[PDB]
Amino acid sequence: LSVDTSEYNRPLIHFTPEKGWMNAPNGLFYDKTAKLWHLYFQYNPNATAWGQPLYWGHATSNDLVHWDEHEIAIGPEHDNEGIFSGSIVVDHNNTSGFFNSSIDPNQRIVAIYTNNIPDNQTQDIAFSLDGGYTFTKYENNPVIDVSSNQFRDPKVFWHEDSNQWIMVVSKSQEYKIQIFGSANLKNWVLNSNFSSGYYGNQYECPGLIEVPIENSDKSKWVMFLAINPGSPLGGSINQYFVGDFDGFQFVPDDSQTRFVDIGKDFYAFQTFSEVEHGVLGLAWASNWQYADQVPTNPWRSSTSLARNYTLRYVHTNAETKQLTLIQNPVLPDSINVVDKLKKKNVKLTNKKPIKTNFKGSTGLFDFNITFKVLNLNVSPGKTHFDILINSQELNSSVDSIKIGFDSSQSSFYIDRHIPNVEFPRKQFFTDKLAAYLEPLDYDQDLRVFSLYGIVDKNIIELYFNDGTVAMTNTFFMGEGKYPHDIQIVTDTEEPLFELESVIIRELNK
Amino acid sequence: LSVDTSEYNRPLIHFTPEKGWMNAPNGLFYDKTAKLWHLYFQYNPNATAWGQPLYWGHATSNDLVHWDEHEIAIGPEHDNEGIFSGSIVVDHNNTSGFFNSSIDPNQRIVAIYTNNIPDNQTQDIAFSLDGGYTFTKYENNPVIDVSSNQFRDPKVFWHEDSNQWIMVVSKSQEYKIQIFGSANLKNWVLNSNFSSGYYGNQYECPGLIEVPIENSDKSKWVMFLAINPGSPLGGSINQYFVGDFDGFQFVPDDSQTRFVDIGKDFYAFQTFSEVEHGVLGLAWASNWQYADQVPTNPWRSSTSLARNYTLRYVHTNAETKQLTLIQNPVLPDSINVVDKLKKKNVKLTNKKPIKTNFKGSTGLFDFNITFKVLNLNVSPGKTHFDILINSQELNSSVDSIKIGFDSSQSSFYIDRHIPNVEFPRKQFFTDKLAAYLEPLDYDQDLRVFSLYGIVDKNIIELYFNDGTVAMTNTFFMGEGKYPHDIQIVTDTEEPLFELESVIIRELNK
């Protein structure tokens, strides 16, 4: 309680609780009357570690970057217990019977969540009569009990075409996504089981939603699935499947495995209810392997930014395109640009590096680059360029993380290694991660790629080729240090890389 | 040609060419008459890098650890071209018409391989009349041409039940494994396409074989598949599927994705033909991201050890078992044990570390541990133990790689980071890799696990829980340095880990 790392460590525009522990985001919805985005979260107010009693924390936002934290929304009946993950729906037509005439239809808020008690996980419901700040648990909870220890994380949505509420929920250790239906929110029927992809140890946090295909009238149903432990990257990861849904079973178009975000730190993704126009969601931005040991205090964990989800046909090799999940960050105009560097058609060479030259630093930056690979035979050790994110100098040292692209491998990479920062379970804190991408485009016969990145004091979110792939990782600079400036460098004497466009901004609340 | 790193860098019992570049192993077969294992391989004699003309190199062995290199077996028609990957079968009954009355049935050797020419990849055959040392290409090559640029890596086998030769080959960029049948080895018919798992950039090096289930009469068909680039670990990786095969189509038992080896350096896996009793195979032990840049000379690349493949029902979580691919290394008794450390029931503590104390070092070691996790509440930074593989001291420093287990994560890990060793494309040389495993067993209520590891100068092969998962990685110690001794250490004051059995051996040719 006496050490506060916020000054250098606490994100400006990623949500964090003032104190205590946060994991999975819950009950994501938009209130159309109040015009407020609601974020709830797995919350332990009593320590910077997971533990019971576990609650739903609650915060609101009008723009998905500025958050007001509120009083705890739901709590367990005993210290022995926890209100585990869930989702919220708006029961406009009072199908649940909970709501007065005088409750605004857009605020008829129902939470559906896992109630965790010793040897039992059930699905329970509660309703809010005050706009989502307090709740009354349903008299006849549980609404679903299958006598299981491992039965959690409901995502519920109204399905017009089959005229019912749909729940996807994990039967975690059976590796099944279970699909239930209800008229009621109270009485549920099991319609199907879905099993596929990368099983790890466990299925968690399913989601199922209609995602729009870019430049078209058409859509596909996407099933989201979280697994932890046992990610091939180590620990926790989120995956997806593309297909069709009739209200009863989900049928994927193929049987391939794909991850939502191939950084180490993007887990328990959930989408917002009541979004008109598109699909928005966010995740918990850490990894279960080390999330409770990173050096922040008096809180641990942030969410990712909210992101916009679409589908796009992209080349995965030279011959073949696949319909692929695209995501791009939600950043409203209510963000102040303190300063920016903006350049066009720069021929990058080791004698001409790009260097930010701002007066100060908030620790929040973004960078936005479109680049072209030239025809130049260069030595193997130099077929790359690198973006450096440097702290201020402190113990007469600068800390930095590196983001680059190698043209011989057609792959982006990050290196988040920081010397002299140690914490428990760092054996699992992978430093070097890569992503292979086909060109965004061809200009004549030269390969074009794009990269957008945003750095917020302890988290970096990278989006390659207009969101073709996303990679999210936290990073921990030494005590007192935070991002101060940005450089783009290369070791080539002539130009291998031409940056058609470079924009680097310092940003603030 | 003047620098030779062999002294510290060249494996003793993993095959390497004397000079030049090697990638994928080819034409693996056992000659029953000669009693010789044959290894062919993608070979460039003219540089320590991939390039055309590309040949099949050739080596033989009576025990799968001692290799005799021979003259190039197959070469391209022009410098423009390459004999890409392939397999060998023994046509005992002369179905191909190539073989005399006086050619021993067990030596009726036919190679089936991809002929790579500009804008064209076809499948071609050649036969050997002198036991596999020289070949005559078939008069009417190609045997299969589908007018494709991306059509390569045939694995062929006799399928008794449908009375035909089967070929699995990759239609690389279409992400299809294509299954062809022949009476002939000359005239082929397409029977099915198979598409699943982790797509990556490209399908390569398929395999299809009947694998025995442990302690039973039963078996399953396993389909192997290599992808590169685009492994979720970065670069190249091998995956598999378990199911059934009728000679015409492969039908997996589920749609899950699983990798054969979750280290960075295990690619283009092939099995040996003419193995009676079980399934044996090996891979190329590097990763395409950096294989051509690692600091060895005058050669680059080794194969993995030959491994024995079985299927076993293992716990993937506390509730659920899955039928899972098991592998264990083939190490004959023709291996000399120079010295060994052997201990039983050791309560590991930071005051009582295990330390090898041998007179010298060949650079080749193995370690074999069964251990039990005790009930001891210890601080989070200490819930692990570590195996250290140390070089001799040189520039007044010891280089080392680390292999460990953390009990809070139930996961093994490696850290192959070595200071002051640099080479091109090391951004992709991932240092930290993990593997989550359920307990091998329970002793009362205490968790039991096992680990076998083998280190051979520049390559480490780890096998967790009697081969439940395998992890293969190269490593590059500083100039002159190689493994000299081994330690097992922990930071706990009391004992969290009891090692029921520990055997560390120094080994030699």
Ligand SMILES: *[C@@H]1O[C@H](CO)[C@@H](O)[C@H](O)[C@H]1NC(C)=O
């Ligand atoms: C946990 O937090 C709750 C609410 O802030 C508080 O009532 C309680 O005392 C804390 N600790 C325990 C063990 O309940």
Ligand SMILES: *[C@@H]1O[C@H](CO)[C@@H](O)[C@H](O)[C@H]1NC(C)=O
């Ligand atoms: C789905 O899974 C559960 C196992 O938990 C089983 O009880 C149920 O019968 C299955 N339903 C269908 C439709 O397969």
Ligand SMILES: *[C@@H]1O[C@H](CO)[C@@H](O)[C@H](O)[C@H]1NC(C)=O
């Ligand atoms: C979501 O992205 C989509 C593009 O399909 C757009 O319709 C919508 O306005 C976006 N919402 C936000 C908050 O950016």
Ligand SMILES: *[C@@H]1O[C@H](CO)[C@@H](O)[C@H](O)[C@H]1NC(C)=O
């Ligand atoms: C990065 O580059 C340009 C700058 O206007 C733009 O097309 C693109 O939207 C930028 N990306 C983001 C996410 O702001």
Ligand SMILES: *[C@@H]1O[C@H](CO)[C@@H](O)[C@H](O)[C@H]1NC(C)=O
């Ligand atoms: C079989 O062919 C070989 C190889 O050229 C030849 O030497 C041999 O004499 C032939 N044997 C018979 C029986 O024709």
Ligand SMILES: *[C@@H]1O[C@H](CO)[C@@H](O)[C@H](O)[C@H]1NC(C)=O
């Ligand atoms: C096998 O896939 C090939 C290559 O695309 C295709 O032409 C052929 O029609 C496929 N056959 C079947 C039965 O799917």
Ligand SMILES: *[C@@H]1O[C@H](CO)[C@@H](O)[C@H](O)[C@H]1NC(C)=O
């Ligand atoms: C391969 O391992 C299997 C496992 O039972 C065994 O039957 C066979 O004899 C082994 N062969 C070798 C060379 O280890």
Ligand SMILES: *[C@@H]1O[C@H](CO)[C@@H](O)[C@H](O)[C@H]1NC(C)=O
């Ligand atoms: C290591 O020890 C096990 C169990 O004691 C033994 O059965 C096995 O043969 C050894 N394994 C290897 C790969 O040498």
